[PDB]
Motif scaffolding. Sequence first.
Motif, PDB file in Angstrom:
ATOM      1  N   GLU A 102      11.673  -2.270   7.627  1.00  0.00           N
ATOM      2  CA  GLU A 102      10.805  -3.184   8.390  1.00  0.00           C
ATOM      3  C   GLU A 102       9.320  -2.792   8.237  1.00  0.00           C
ATOM      4  OE1 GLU A 102      12.362  -3.581  12.417  1.00  0.00           O
ATOM      5  OE2 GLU A 102      14.405  -3.981  11.708  1.00  0.00           O
ATOM      6  N   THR A 103       9.033  -1.497   8.294  1.00  0.00           N
ATOM      7  CA  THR A 103       7.655  -1.015   8.192  1.00  0.00           C
ATOM      8  C   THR A 103       7.081  -1.217   6.801  1.00  0.00           C
ATOM      9  OG1 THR A 103       7.996   0.575   9.972  1.00  0.00           O
ATOM     10  CG2 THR A 103       6.123   0.976   8.532  1.00  0.00           C
ATOM     11  N   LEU A 104       7.897  -0.980   5.775  1.00  0.00           N
ATOM     12  CA  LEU A 104       7.465  -1.196   4.392  1.00  0.00           C
ATOM     13  C   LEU A 104       7.174  -2.649   4.169  1.00  0.00           C
ATOM     14  CD1 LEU A 104       9.770   1.209   2.576  1.00  0.00           C
ATOM     15  CD2 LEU A 104       7.302   1.030   2.100  1.00  0.00           C
ATOM     16  N   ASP A 105       8.047  -3.510   4.678  1.00  0.00           N
ATOM     17  CA  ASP A 105       7.814  -4.939   4.563  1.00  0.00           C
ATOM     18  C   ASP A 105       6.476  -5.373   5.150  1.00  0.00           C
ATOM     19  OD1 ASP A 105       8.819  -7.507   3.598  1.00  0.00           O
ATOM     20  OD2 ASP A 105       8.759  -8.046   5.768  1.00  0.00           O
ATOM     21  N   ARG A 106       6.210  -4.939   6.384  1.00  0.00           N
ATOM     22  CA  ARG A 106       4.995  -5.295   7.127  1.00  0.00           C
ATOM     23  C   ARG A 106       3.762  -4.797   6.392  1.00  0.00           C
ATOM     24  NH1 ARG A 106       4.832  -1.809  11.264  1.00  0.00           N
ATOM     25  NH2 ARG A 106       2.826  -0.933  10.500  1.00  0.00           N
ATOM     26  N   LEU A 107       3.792  -3.538   5.986  1.00  0.00           N
ATOM     27  CA  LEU A 107       2.694  -2.954   5.232  1.00  0.00           C
ATOM     28  C   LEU A 107       2.530  -3.578   3.833  1.00  0.00           C
ATOM     29  CD1 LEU A 107       3.213   0.836   6.193  1.00  0.00           C
ATOM     30  CD2 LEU A 107       1.294  -0.600   7.023  1.00  0.00           C
ATOM     31  N   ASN A 108       3.645  -3.799   3.110  1.00  0.00           N
ATOM     32  CA  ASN A 108       3.578  -4.564   1.865  1.00  0.00           C
ATOM     33  C   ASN A 108       2.773  -5.850   2.083  1.00  0.00           C
ATOM     34  OD1 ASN A 108       5.223  -2.778   0.374  1.00  0.00           O
ATOM     35  ND2 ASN A 108       7.065  -4.054   0.596  1.00  0.00           N
ATOM     36  N   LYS A 109       3.209  -6.662   3.040  1.00  0.00           N
ATOM     37  CA  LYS A 109       2.604  -7.962   3.267  1.00  0.00           C
ATOM     38  C   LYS A 109       1.198  -7.844   3.858  1.00  0.00           C
ATOM     39  CE  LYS A 109       6.677 -10.217   2.257  1.00  0.00           C
ATOM     40  NZ  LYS A 109       7.833 -10.179   3.205  1.00  0.00           N
ATOM     41  N   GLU A 110       0.862  -6.685   4.417  1.00  0.00           N
ATOM     42  CA  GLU A 110      -0.501  -6.449   4.881  1.00  0.00           C
ATOM     43  C   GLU A 110      -1.465  -6.045   3.762  1.00  0.00           C
ATOM     44  OE1 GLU A 110      -0.185  -3.750   8.048  1.00  0.00           O
ATOM     45  OE2 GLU A 110       0.535  -5.259   9.485  1.00  0.00           O
ATOM     46  N   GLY A 111      -0.937  -5.873   2.550  1.00  0.00           N
ATOM     47  CA  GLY A 111      -1.750  -5.578   1.383  1.00  0.00           C
ATOM     48  C   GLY A 111      -1.927  -4.082   1.277  1.00  0.00           C
ATOM     49  N   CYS A 112      -1.076  -3.331   1.966  1.00  0.00           N
ATOM     50  CA  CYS A 112      -1.204  -1.868   1.929  1.00  0.00           C
ATOM     51  C   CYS A 112      -1.089  -1.377   0.494  1.00  0.00           C
ATOM     52  CB  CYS A 112      -0.155  -1.190   2.799  1.00  0.00           C
ATOM     53  SG  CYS A 112      -0.333   0.608   2.703  1.00  0.00           S
ATOM     54  N   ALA A 113      -1.972  -0.461   0.095  1.00  0.00           N
ATOM     55  CA  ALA A 113      -2.166  -0.165  -1.336  1.00  0.00           C
ATOM     56  C   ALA A 113      -1.337   0.993  -1.904  1.00  0.00           C
ATOM     57  CB  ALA A 113      -3.659   0.065  -1.610  1.00  0.00           C
ATOM     58  N   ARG A 114      -0.809   1.829  -1.025  1.00  0.00           N
ATOM     59  CA  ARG A 114      -0.224   3.074  -1.450  1.00  0.00           C
ATOM     60  C   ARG A 114       0.503   3.677  -0.269  1.00  0.00           C
ATOM     61  NH1 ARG A 114      -4.072   4.189  -3.933  1.00  0.00           N
ATOM     62  NH2 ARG A 114      -3.439   4.284  -6.128  1.00  0.00           N
ATOM     63  N   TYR A 115       1.635   4.307  -0.544  1.00  0.00           N
ATOM     64  CA  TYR A 115       2.389   5.070   0.447  1.00  0.00           C
ATOM     65  C   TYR A 115       2.465   6.535   0.065  1.00  0.00           C
ATOM     66  CZ  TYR A 115       3.660   0.306   1.573  1.00  0.00           C
ATOM     67  OH  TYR A 115       3.581  -1.024   1.976  1.00  0.00           O
ATOM     68  N   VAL A 116       2.432   7.392   1.074  1.00  0.00           N
ATOM     69  CA  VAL A 116       2.723   8.807   0.910  1.00  0.00           C
ATOM     70  C   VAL A 116       4.045   9.041   1.634  1.00  0.00           C
ATOM     71  CG1 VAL A 116       1.940  11.179   1.371  1.00  0.00           C
ATOM     72  CG2 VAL A 116       0.268   9.342   0.777  1.00  0.00           C
ATOM     73  N   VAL A 117       5.050   9.491   0.895  1.00  0.00           N
ATOM     74  CA  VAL A 117       6.404   9.557   1.435  1.00  0.00           C
ATOM     75  C   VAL A 117       6.845  11.003   1.641  1.00  0.00           C
ATOM     76  CG1 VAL A 117       8.846   9.023   0.951  1.00  0.00           C
ATOM     77  CG2 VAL A 117       7.071   7.284   0.499  1.00  0.00           C
TER      78      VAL A 117
END
Length: 233
Positions: A150-165
């Motif tokens: 759910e969080t990845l989806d929201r951030l994806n669609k928010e144009g989030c540029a990069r994740y640190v996992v």
Amino acid sequence: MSKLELLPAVDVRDGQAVRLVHGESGTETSYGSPLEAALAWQRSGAEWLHLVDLDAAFGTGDNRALIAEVAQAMDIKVELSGGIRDDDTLAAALATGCTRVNLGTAALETPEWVAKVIAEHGDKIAVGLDVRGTTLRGNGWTRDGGDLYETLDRLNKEGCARYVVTDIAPNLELLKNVCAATDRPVVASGGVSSLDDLRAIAGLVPAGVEGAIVGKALYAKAFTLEEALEATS
């Protein structure tokens, strides 16, 4: 092109470079000066410095002026993290001239603020995910959460540029699983204790892993940084 970016970590607590055993507080071995540590990494040909305020992250104060002094001493790319949860902390962090910051707890606690700052600052913003199975965790004085997908989806669609996992339970399965859920670069954090681990992570570059944050191993002299730079391409 096969090349894993390497980000040597300087994690700051009580004015010192420290070791953060697991996703935990107070397990800190001290490695001396953060400025000397960062200058060592740079001298050894690091492209990146991952610089962290553990005090701000854990809500026991801050090292904002020290972090700012280390950032000013770097001729290389700087990724800043730690307690970046509002406009004033974000403004000071970006004023270091750093290449990007990581927001973590803020993504779980104030999704709208993260949405707003991604819109304003683009790829100066990356979001950290601290994953326990499929559940996300933060450093708030109130144990937060969220679903990974759910969080990845929201951030994806928010144009989030990069994740640190980060695995909060290298977890190459988790990395690949996050790579499956996004077209945005994923930076691996934690778990590297050998050059074996780095090549294992670099194998995931075509899946969408862009780089790996390395801390503990470099401080404990598991390998040299020069050896790490060789092994990552």
